[PDB]
Structure 1
Amino acid sequence: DAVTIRTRKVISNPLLARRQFVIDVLHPNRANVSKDELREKLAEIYKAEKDAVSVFGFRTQFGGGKSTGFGLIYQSVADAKRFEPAYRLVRYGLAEKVEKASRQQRKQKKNRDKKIFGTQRRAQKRAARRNA
């Protein structure tokens, strides 16, 4: 209801081929909209694609209503993929959260490779022959 998008402190960022500014939502009678919704409104306002828009860090003033945030308007999915981290892309869907094990499991494996010199196959076959 009467959602408005208000921008200040705009930096044209060619080094990362993007653009940095601050984004304010003026929404009454509502909790707040999802970040993705601000991405579609930013897209419609600035006639850029959805995947070239990224926003983050939204906080509302005391008393409800108005919220601030920070957003990036890239100039391709290619650019928004070149200059961006994995967690934002997993948020949107432009990537996938890689299925690594836990930190303890990975560290324990890496320490467990410190007890073998040379290739794993060599040790495996050697131990198999000695366990006959």
Structure 2
Amino acid sequence: STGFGLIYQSVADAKRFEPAYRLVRYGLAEKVEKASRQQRKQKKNRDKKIFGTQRRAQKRAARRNAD
């Protein structure tokens, strides 16, 4: 078999100049947990319809729905 290898002068140096996925392979880091790309994009576009703080936007939306 043929591959590629890196050896750093220290573990601290290795943790700085390495991709995240390789550190997760070796157990030196935890896989970051995030929503799917669809959810992140939909949330970003949903926040685009709000001007100002979310607290103001939902309180004003709540006032309109007198229910």
TM-score (norm 1): 0.48
Q: Secondary structure at the match of 1:84?
A: coil
TM-score (norm 2): 0.90
Larger relative contact order (Cα-Cα within 8 Å, sequence gap ≥ 6): 1
Structure 1's consecutive aligned runs of 4 or more residues displaced over 6 angstroms after TM superposition are none
Deviations for 1:92-119, whole angstroms, at most 9, x for unmatched residues?
A: 1111111111111111110111111111
Highest CA radius of gyration, 1 or 2? 1
Cα RMSD between the aligned structures?
0.9
Deviation at 1:130, TM superposition (A): 2.0
More strand by share: 1
Q: What's 1:114 paired with? A: 48
Deviations for 1:18-69, whole angstroms, at most 9, x for unmatched residues?
A: xxxxxxxxxxxxxxxxxxxxxxxxxxxxxxxxxxxxxxxxxxxxxxxxx111
Q: Name the CA distance, whole Å, in 1 between partners of 2:28 and 2:6.
A: 15
Instruction: Could you tell me which runs of 5 or more consecutive residues in structure 1 were left unpaired when the two chains were aligned.
Output: 1-66
Give the paired residue count: 66
